[PDB]
Amino acid sequence: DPSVYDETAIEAYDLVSSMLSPGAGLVAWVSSHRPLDGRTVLDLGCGTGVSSFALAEAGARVVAVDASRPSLDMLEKKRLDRDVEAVEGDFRDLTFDSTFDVVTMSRNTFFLAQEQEEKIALLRGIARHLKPGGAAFLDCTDPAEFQRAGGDARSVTYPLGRDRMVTVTQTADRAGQQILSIFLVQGATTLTAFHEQATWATLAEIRLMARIAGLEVTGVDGSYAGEPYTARSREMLVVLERQ
Amino acid sequence: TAIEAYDLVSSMLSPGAGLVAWVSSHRPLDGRTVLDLGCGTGVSSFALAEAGARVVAVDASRPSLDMLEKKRLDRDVEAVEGDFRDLTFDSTFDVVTMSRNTFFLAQEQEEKIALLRGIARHLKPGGAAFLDCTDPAEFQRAGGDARSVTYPLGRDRMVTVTQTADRAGQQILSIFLVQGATTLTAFHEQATWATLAEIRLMARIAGLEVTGVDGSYAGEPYTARSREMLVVLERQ
Amino acid sequence: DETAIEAYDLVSSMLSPGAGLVAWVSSHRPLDGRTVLDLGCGTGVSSFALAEAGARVVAVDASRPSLDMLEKKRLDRDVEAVEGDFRDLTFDSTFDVVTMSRNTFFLAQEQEEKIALLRGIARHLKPGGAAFLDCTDPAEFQRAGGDARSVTYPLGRDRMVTVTQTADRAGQQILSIFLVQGATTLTAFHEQATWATLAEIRLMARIAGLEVTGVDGSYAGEPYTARSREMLVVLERQ
Amino acid sequence: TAIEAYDLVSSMLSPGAGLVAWVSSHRPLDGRTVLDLGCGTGVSSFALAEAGARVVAVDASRPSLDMLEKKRLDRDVEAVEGDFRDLTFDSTFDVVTMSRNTFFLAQEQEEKIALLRGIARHLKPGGAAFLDCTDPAEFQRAGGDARSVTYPLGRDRMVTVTQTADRAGQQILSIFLVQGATTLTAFHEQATWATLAEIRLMARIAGLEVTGVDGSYAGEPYTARSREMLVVLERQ
Amino acid sequence: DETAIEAYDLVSSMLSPGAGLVAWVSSHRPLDGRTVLDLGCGTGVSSFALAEAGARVVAVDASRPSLDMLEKKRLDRDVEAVEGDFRDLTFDSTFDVVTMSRNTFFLAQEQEEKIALLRGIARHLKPGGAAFLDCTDPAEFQRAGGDARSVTYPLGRDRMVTVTQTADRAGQQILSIFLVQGATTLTAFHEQATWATLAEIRLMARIAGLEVTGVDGSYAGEPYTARSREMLVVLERQ
Amino acid sequence: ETAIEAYDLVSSMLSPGAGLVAWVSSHRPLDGRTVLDLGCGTGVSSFALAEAGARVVAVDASRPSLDMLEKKRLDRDVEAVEGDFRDLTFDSTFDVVTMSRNTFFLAQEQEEKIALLRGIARHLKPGGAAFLDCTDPAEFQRAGGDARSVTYPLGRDRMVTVTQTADRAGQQILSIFLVQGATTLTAFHEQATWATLAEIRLMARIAGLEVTGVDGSYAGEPYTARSREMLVVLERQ
Ligand SMILES: Nc1ncnc2c1ncn2[C@@H]1O[C@H](CSCC[C@H](N)C(=O)O)[C@@H](O)[C@H]1O
Ligand SMILES: Nc1ncnc2c1ncn2[C@@H]1O[C@H](CSCC[C@H](N)C(=O)O)[C@@H](O)[C@H]1O
Ligand SMILES: Nc1ncnc2c1ncn2[C@@H]1O[C@H](CSCC[C@H](N)C(=O)O)[C@@H](O)[C@H]1O
Ligand SMILES: Nc1ncnc2c1ncn2[C@@H]1O[C@H](CSCC[C@H](N)C(=O)O)[C@@H](O)[C@H]1O
Ligand SMILES: Nc1ncnc2c1ncn2[C@@H]1O[C@H](CSCC[C@H](N)C(=O)O)[C@@H](O)[C@H]1O
Ligand SMILES: Nc1ncnc2c1ncn2[C@@H]1O[C@H](CSCC[C@H](N)C(=O)O)[C@@H](O)[C@H]1O
Secondary structure (H helix, E strand, O other): OOOHHHHHHHHHHHHHHHHHOOOHHHHHHHHOOOOOOOOEEEEEOOOOOHHHHHHHOOOOEEEEEEOOHHHHHHHHHHHOOOOEEEEEOOOOOOOOOOOEEEEEEOOOHHHHOOOHHHHHHHHHHHHHOEEEEEEEEEEEEOHHHHHOOOOOOEEEEEEOOOOEEEEEEEEEEOOOOEEEEEEEEEEOOEEEEEEEEEEOOOHHHHHHHHHHHOEEEEEEEOOOOOOEOOOOOOEEEEEEEEO | OHHHHHHHHHHHHOOOHHHHHHHHOOOOOOOOEEEEEOOOOOHHHHHHHOOOOEEEEEEOOHHHHHHHHHHHOOOOEEEEEOOOOOOOOOOOEEEEEEOOOHHHHOOOHHHHHHHHHHHHHOEEEEEEEEEEEEOHHHHHOOOOOOEEEEEEOOOOEEEEEEEEEEOOOOEEEEEEEEEEOOEEEEEEEEEEOOOHHHHHHHHHHHOEEEEEEEOOOOOOEOOOOOOEEEEEEEEO | OHHHHHHHHHHHHHHOOOHHHHHHHHOOOOOOOOEEEEEOOOOOHHHHHHHHOOOEEEEEEOOHHHHHHHHHHHOOOOEEEEEOEOOEOOOOOOEEEEEEOOOHHHHOOOHHHHHHHHHHHHHOEEEEEEEEEEEEOHHHHHOOOOOOEEEEEEOOOOOEEEEEEEEEOOOOEEEEEEEEEEOOEEEEEEEEEEOOOHHHHHHHHHHHOEEEEEEEOOOOOOEOOOOOOEEEEEEEEO | OHHHHHHHHHHHHOOOHHHHHHHHOOOOOOOOEEEEEOOOOOHHHHHHHHOOOEEEEEEOOHHHHHHHHHHHOOOOEEEEEOOOOOOOOOOOEEEEEEOOOHHHHOOOHHHHHHHHHHHHHOEEEEEEEEEEEEOHHHHHOOOOOOEEEEEEOOOOEEEEEEEEEEOOOOEEEEEEEEEEOOOEEEEEEEEEOOOHHHHHHHHHHHOEEEEEEEOOOOOOEOOOOOOEEEEEEEEO | OHHHHHHHHHHHHHHOOOHHHHHHHHOOOOOOOOEEEEEOOOOOHHHHHHHHOOOEEEEEEOOHHHHHHHHHHOOOOOEEEEEOOOOOOOOOOOEEEEEEOOOHHHHOOOHHHHHHHHHHHHHOEEEEEEEEEEEEOHHHHHHHHHOOEEEEEEOOOOOEEEEEEEEEOOOOEEEEEEEEEOOOOEEEEEEEEEOOOHHHHHHHHHHOOEEEEEEEOOOOOOEOOOOOOEEEEEEEEO | OHHHHHHHHHHHHHOOOHHHHHHHHOOOOOOOOEEEEEOOOOOHHHHHHHHOOOEEEEEEOOHHHHHHHHHHHOOOOEEEEEOOOOOOOOOOOEEEEEEOOOHHHHOOOHHHHHHHHHHHHHOEEEEEEEEEEEEOHHHHHOOOOOOEEEEEEOOOOOEEEEEEEEEOOOOEEEEEEEEEOOOOEEEEEEEEEOOOHHHHHHHHHHHOEEEEEEEOOOOOOEOOOOOOEEEEEEEEO
């Protein structure tokens, strides 16, 4: 069956994201700005729900959007009794109209709207789907981190339990602001490779994009702990609200 | 005295020839009109006029224009006092220039947008604007920690440049300490940089479009290895 | 040499003002009306800042010319200038607060000298008092493999100082050359120090009867971490 | 089997198209004779043959030539066992190629001189030799400390490359660890680099002259910012 | 664990063979017919190199599975395997030489534990004996700011190990993850250590009755300098 | 000329001859031996060699530098000779030939270094040795060749700022020297073309010499990847 290849990749992705990007940091960071217990969350690029389920475990009701039907398939299988509604859609152009208390984009998902005009269209969609007093959250690596080796290939290998491992190889083009991550997930007798390419935006770009789209950046933290964003920050956690 | 030192540093460290050679590879200058924004004491303006151009040189510093005039001799340069964040005249030009990093002296993003609006309003239909910039990645190589380099300025003068930066505010501060055998003059300039991606958006808001970027005065395309960011803009 | 002391006082006044030390110290212990022992006081930049927060300051330096400059500058500030070696303090007296301004602690060069200093600090602390070692994080000194680096700072409109630094990681030695210039003047001096990491200081403190009870990463008082560039050590009697 | 693993690594990480494009920009290949030295399993040789060249391909590894001949099909490539430090046949060619860093596998300087002498002896009057090399400054960036990068090789295979260097001996060692879900094949190559300055000297000794140097397959001039050192040599 | 110990023995045998340790020790104390206490002996990579130089070896480790492997490999070599905690040795023998192989000293984590370890070394040295701490220079652990880095090494033709390290400069903590692989096998283990600089070690040694008497920068015996990447510490009594 | 006086002060303080003398003495005796010191300048190297007992012939193309040498010479056995070390015309042989720190790089083109080395071979007695005192050129590349400045004291009343740029493809290194007192400023510059040890081996062979030793510091450590100096000992083939 052909789609087993993509299913195995989605399973690997879910394992990598579960261990290397748990939802807890996003949940801790969002909660420092807005209450989640009893509120509504629009989670854009929910994937297999690592971010979505952690938001639900904080008491939120989550509407979780992804363009990948197999990833939503895995979310529904793992959902169990969690209050997460899986929705197939393109976060560059949301068709349905509703408004939420908080909107979230997990670590670097915002950079998967590649072109600047795609980021703008995405932000217009976030504005249109935000309650007047709502706030949207862009969980991002500070893009300075992507330029540290001149964009040359670098590889780091992490354990995924004592039976699995993942090697991440990353290259970047500073002029196009492109970053490409190859993921090689291995067990004793298995190897699954998949990749993902993103176009980053700096905080200064996001201020202009937000302004174009009808949003305003109202806060930036430098870590999940809520420290303010400074030159020494390695993360760029953007809070936005309607103009 | 500080304006004199400023003029010497600019004449030696940022001569106008590269800007002229880079602008010339995109637009002819002999006989064309040029609006030179942030002309200062005129180092860029003079080099443009000497390429054939009728130049209108604009600066907000009356004392810098004073020295432009005393050094202009017979070059075709009309010095004008004005704020390039809000130009108040009605001319239209073949070519608009901003010398090395002058663009970064419109500090806030809204000020760069107001400046680029003014530039669009003063371009002829087929004109082109030129932003001579350091690639801002260069400002970030030391984490923004104070670094100093010392340059000769002839056989009798020298300048020490000490720079600090804040990457989050995109601020860069340059302190200039100009010395002779028995003189010391100090001055500083602080700028807010913007990346090419930022400039693409600012251009669009303002009514212009980036139509080319070069990586050096020689005309290499702008790549991740470029250390300069030479932006060409046209009306959309 | 007199011109050297003037140049030193100007550099310290501009690039190491006492305001930061006073703010940090005030985060942990009150100064208004308390007694402060300021060790390695120099020409008084730290000491005057401490006196201006209301402390009764006893200021100790081994450099009689520096103390002379301190006394010239002192005016009515409540600072007593004492010539002495802080590796071996001669007088008996206990204080609410003991201070060592930025990197002065590293001027007791050998580890045994640092230990002798810390014992003196312990013997001059009131039971509830605290000692404060204001230090650069010594990781900062190893940044270029100890190779010579120079940075030039303005000192107002008409003066400047170029600081050239070299370090030897194995001896934990750092050498700073200060070249102070005006239009028609040039004065050079130097200072060589031996740094100690926080881990070393914990040991030396314990040997001397002190305990490291707090470490801040900057004058603003956030905790010391791997990302800190300053190492501001609070110590108390055991 | 290490031969199979090497062929896979080279086919995907250093295909011949780059070398072919670079050589083409200096000499035509359609219908010409080409001597490909250290041809290996023929990644370079077959790209050259597909450009229309008649290729004699020399390697000292008979298992590698076995793989070449297995892969050849109808491509115009003659496989020859030989040591390019001492080529013992007499034919004369239009173009001589050595693929990425193969020139560095003649280890000692005298071996490199012997190799270049053989290249001169096998070049036709208006012919040209091509040394495709990394710029050796790239090998010193980490002080020669061990560094590892892991590359995909399609969906179900990968190679980890671990490199160490010795600046004083100009030695670079590469370990290749090729893996699939249930396989692991390891092999290594050790090389001795030479800078452009050394190559100019070795060339004159051997009877050649460096006539061009490019910094990339796209034919940019070689400069301080180049990361490749592509050398064109002609007979004296 | 059984496969974990085997993976460890392969990694140790190939990435840190005993030959270097023995050549270094032998340049300070000839070993033929001497008694050697090898602390943190593991599966005996250091212990058997020492025995092969002619020493009579007591090899101490807290891991019974590792000592079982040592005993399986021992054959005729003069090594006695003893289960014990080197922070607190309960037997009373004395030795010409005490060895701790590469970075094993850093596995006595806290400063107080290193001191107890060093006291135990002193109590177990004969008159004129010497102890040898084979360490990486901890400056190496601070490149990259403690950020995760990975390096992959072959282990023969058909096995490999990827070592991934992270560090916290303030805690002086270094964590190494070892991922050992064959064509169809994957075994992961890890070790976390607390480093100490030479300056720290001098102090701990003195607190424990010992004295740093020599420091080499490599197994070849050249002196320890700012350029050294290894810190090979020689200790003797009083 | 003030430039030469500043040159002498900078060279005397930032590059004393003592290290060269100690390194050379660890390979050949100097006491009563003959030394050809090429590119002697104002004699910082030549005088330190004479203090070790050498009978020194000191060659330089700058007549004003030689004038200052003769003026500082006083007692010492140093004969100043105006000449071009790429084309030495006198005919004498010596026990030792020296080139002080980085002077070998002032023979700019590779063919000029080869002519120099041929002259060295022609002026060495059999059994003699030649010494090229050099910075390891890797040091010139540490900043990608970007401008870097370091300021050194020159006593209490003088200083010098050295600003260096490099072009790794041309193997060019440019040093600008800004010498100051309280009331003076004198600027001058020197540009050189470096050669690596591997280049020097080949150039030596072409010229009839052989590299027989390389040290990594004046102490005589061996030359390794961690060395920051490249001290080359050469002998006739
Ligand atoms: N235009 C688009 N519209 C919707 N989803 C998109 C998209 N572009 C990318 N995605 C999705 O964005 C996801 C990014 S990975 C993050 C997944 C999840 N939030 C977690 O916490 O792990 C992928 O699932 C991808 O399919
Ligand atoms: N609105 C404005 N805001 C900031 N700087 C302005 C300005 N209008 C003019 N300037 C001038 O911008 C100049 C930057 S320096 C560049 C000067 C000149 N083009 C040269 O080639 O040297 C200063 O002279 C500053 O006074
Ligand atoms: N052993 C010692 N005993 C006393 N003072 C000493 C000393 N070693 C160094 N010092 C003094 O410590 C000072 C260091 S500079 C700090 C000066 C002052 N606290 C300020 O804030 O500027 C010098 O004045 C020096 O003379
Ligand atoms: N004398 C010699 N010394 C070293 N390697 C030699 C050699 N003669 C041939 N070679 C070969 O040089 C090759 C280097 S890699 C092979 C490159 C091949 N042209 C490709 O494009 O992939 C090896 O195959 C090696 O066996
Ligand atoms: N407190 C302690 N007491 C005894 N052994 C300890 C210990 N802490 C760690 N160890 C042991 O120290 C060893 C470190 S690895 C070094 C093993 C061996 N010397 C070799 O050459 O390979 C491990 O075997 C571990 O179990
Ligand atoms: N071709 C050449 N022939 C002779 N001297 C030369 C030369 N090229 C450069 N020089 C000289 O080489 C000298 C280099 S500076 C070193 C001077 C001296 N040995 C010392 O120890 O300070 C200069 O004096 C310069 O004039």
